[PDB]
Subunit: 247 residues, 4 copies
């Protein structure tokens, strides 16, 4: 007889999601990036052994860093990410908190915020608040490492990417697109998945602010750190912003 | 900071669903329809006390009929519907089975299939199979009552309907549309719901066959029942098809 | 034979749309709101005869205001809205421009921005830029009227609304929901429409900033206007912010 | 300022579509399949020079066949396909008609229906009608070639496929899934496309009937053709059904 077909769609706000972050992570060199942090910190703070990673996602960078920085922690707003990070690490707490205003009641030799995550900040004032909150988790001589998002100058229009993962009984395809709006880059990601249970379609739209170099350096100085822009680490044409907390 | 937005959509086959059937049921006169069945059965079988309702949905017609037909049962393919019907009734079994070929190992004084449900049959042969399976659950003198779907002649193009249910902290709206394809009516139903958890969109597309009067009467005769078409019960311009099982 | 079913979905950025604004407008008292503007302007500027409406949408408020302010204009970023407004008005130009930084090369006795449209501004600095751009289209003694969006204090969580319009051969239903995120209200609107051509589903998600009273008054003062908050016009519990441009 | 995001979705019935058929066609060996037809026809009808391809899609098989069968035609129900086929061919008419009941007022040395297209027939009676309509476009000695869809025995559960086409400024990904329902295979195809205009999602669900070998052979015999099943041409484990029209 005739058999109906159906769909259900649910819509809402989104934060870090396990599989999404797994999936994005596939061609990503967590090792190289952890190395940037280790190197820039140890140059400025040779004995550094404690580290906080702010908006740490799945905790994968921490899994690299902890060999060098055995007294480590994470901060993640997404309950799902926080639980997945904590599962993956050993005796490394991951705290559920807002990068924009958090306080853990301790300091660390280094604080990092990686892969442009700081550009969830919507404006310069909010950027400054995040960098301040990071800086108060440092002692004098502590190192603050920001892997910035793109600037208005360096953001490239026209980006489109896809990926495919074909497993046993399950295939997932991904397509993504980005475009500029004012001083925001808007990122669209769509997934289709198919297995024995059926087909699913997932989508997410997220904005990141395009801050010029001056705004990052400024945020560092206002947070009581001596600001550097380093171009021999980080991604080409963006580099890293580093601050050493001043007495 | 910036907060992403997201959607997840899942696609699959659909059978009877609790809320959907609740919702459809709102202006529906279960009482009037149960009365058609009671009346047509008692005219032909004055002592009738047992009844089987095939594709019984939520079991609401059975809840009316059981006062008159205290030894009752249902058949429902949808596990969700079967469980909801059984919950609503007292000591009335609802069996998970296919109306097209089922066998319960007993007979009943009457068998019904209501609200056009028989027109899930895709063709005349399948219609005949359903009516046969119904007819073998009757003794000699048993009454088979079919509330047919529309025929090619009587189906009306242009149907569009909507409903709204506005509760405390939750609103659901529904919009539906139907159109003819060959000898099939295709029914589209969309829902939007919104509460504190967010917004959801649901959709379903289902076909029903448009059988002419002759095909229903034929199915009855081939199932060993004496066929009637009754026009003073059932919906205007379609009536009911009734069969009395013959020795 | 079997006939496939299908969907196509397109995703993108959205500005003012004709039918959407028609639809929203249905219970809206354009007359009352135009009256607020007329009254507050004529109290402060008895001879006022020219008016600019910034983010004017369909131009419906202008259609009321022009009897009183016969030398009028609009500003609208959405090409569709701009064309629809201009169609509806007589000899009233509607300019395609950004409310945040526009210059028409003239002044007007009054400038307004209605129904919370100013709260497309993402932060206080951007609010100040819009109000400045408005204020430079005023002479000394000119009146700037802002119908603000809600403040953090006055925004009400839990809003859900629906509408239905049932025409000949066409029905449109609408469902909307809003919630607070930080100092942003996020507004979701879904439509279903059905006619002889089929069924369509439309959705939009839009943010507005929740600015406290001080931020609006501040923006006025920094734009060289003497700031008032008026509570006997505008919506209950929000009022209007008015500025008189100072020499 | 804040910029809304939006989606529009339209739902309806679907027939052959140009890009979809392009896309499906990518790993398809039109040449091999045209060769099956040529070979089976010329074995039985050495002088054969005229051919009709029923449900011809884009006309690509015809573009191969016409070298051998220069007096050719197509039948296609989809206006879009019919126009695209006719564009691609030279002086080969493609008629808009229903494969289930059409009459072109001539015969051809051969009639084919390829890539399982005949299994749009919903039941045996409809299959027989299509094969009859094909057979009356043949003279005595004419060859009818059917590339059948899968049978209940040979249909394989678990099929999932994907494709990707990455062009300059445009990427399209495709994911498909099939499953069995009663004697129907249900096919779901989803596409995501992204270019400078945005992202689009397309989906289609289509049923094909699973007929056993006997039903195809039967249809041939009832259409006045001598039936063969050939296993050294066509796809492995399904072969071709061929009929020679009898005096
Ligand atoms: N306000 C906030 N505070 C803390 N974490 C946040 C946040 N807003 C977003 N995030 C998190 O930031 C992460 C960005 S995804 C990438 C995370 C990681 N640094 C990496 O390089 O792999 C998400 O996991 C999201 O949950
Ligand atoms: N093959 C099958 N066998 C049994 N029930 C079926 C079926 N195909 C569909 N149905 C059921 O038929 C019902 C149609 S909805 C209406 C049911 C009920 N007779 C009424 O009048 O209210 C659905 O609950 C669905 O689950
Ligand atoms: N940056 C910008 N500049 C000008 N208009 C804008 C804008 N951003 C959004 N808008 C417009 O602002 C309008 C908000 S809708 C309501 C408009 C109208 N004032 C009313 O009360 O009816 C939309 O038409 C949208 O196109
Ligand atoms: N009833 C009908 N009559 C004619 N064509 C039909 C039809 N139902 C579906 N079709 C067409 O059948 C085609 C199936 S797609 C494949 C077509 C082609 N034989 C090939 O091998 O490439 C579609 O183009 C669709 O438009
Ligand atoms: C290399 C590079 C990538 N990208 C961006 C565009 C995409 O949105 C994103 C893909 O990782 O990276 C730039 O914006 N600039 C660059 O120089
Ligand atoms: C009254 C009536 C309703 N309908 C149909 C059209 C819709 O698909 C459905 C709504 O219940 O009923 C007919 O087809 N014919 C009729 O005579
Ligand atoms: C009356 C009133 C409406 N609303 C809002 C909630 C909804 O998002 C919107 C509906 O017009 O108005 C407030 O936020 N506060 C109020 O006092
Ligand atoms: C080879 C083969 C493919 N397939 C089907 C499953 C998929 O729905 C479809 C992919 O072309 O082909 C079979 O059903 N049986 C077979 O033997």
């Amino acid at each position: 007889g005739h058999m109906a077909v159906g769909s259900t769609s649910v819509y809402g706000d989104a934060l870090g999601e396990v599989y999404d972050l797994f999936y994005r992570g596939r061609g990503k060199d967590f090792a190289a990036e952890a190395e940037w942090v280790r190197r820039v910190v140890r140059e400025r703070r040779p004995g550094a052994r404690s580290l906080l990673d702010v908006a740490c996602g799945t905790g994968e960078h921490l899994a690299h860093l902890v060999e060098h920085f055995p007294d480590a922690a994470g901060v993640e707003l997404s309950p799902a990410m926080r639980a997945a990070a904590e599962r993956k690490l050993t005796a490394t707490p991951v705290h559920q908190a807002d990068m924009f205003d958090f306080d853990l009641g301790r300091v660390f030799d280094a604080v990092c915020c990686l892969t442009g995550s700081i550009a969830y900040a919507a404006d310069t004032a909010e950027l400054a608040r995040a960098v301040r909150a990071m800086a108060r988790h440092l002692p004098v001589g502590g190192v603050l490492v920001i892997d910035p998002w793109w600037s208005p100058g360096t953001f490239l229009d026209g980006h489109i990417a896809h990926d495919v993962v074909e497993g046993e009984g399950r295939t997932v395809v991904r397509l993504s697109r980005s475009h500029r709006i004012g001083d925001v880059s808007r990122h669209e990601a769509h997934y289709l998945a198919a297995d024995a249970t059926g087909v699913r379609h997932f989508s997410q739209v997220q904005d990141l602010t395009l801050f010029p170099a001056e705004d990052y350096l400024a945020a560092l100085a206002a947070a009581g750190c001596e600001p550097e822009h380093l171009t021999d680490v980080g991604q080409p044409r963006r580099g890293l912003f580093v601050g050493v907390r001043r007495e």
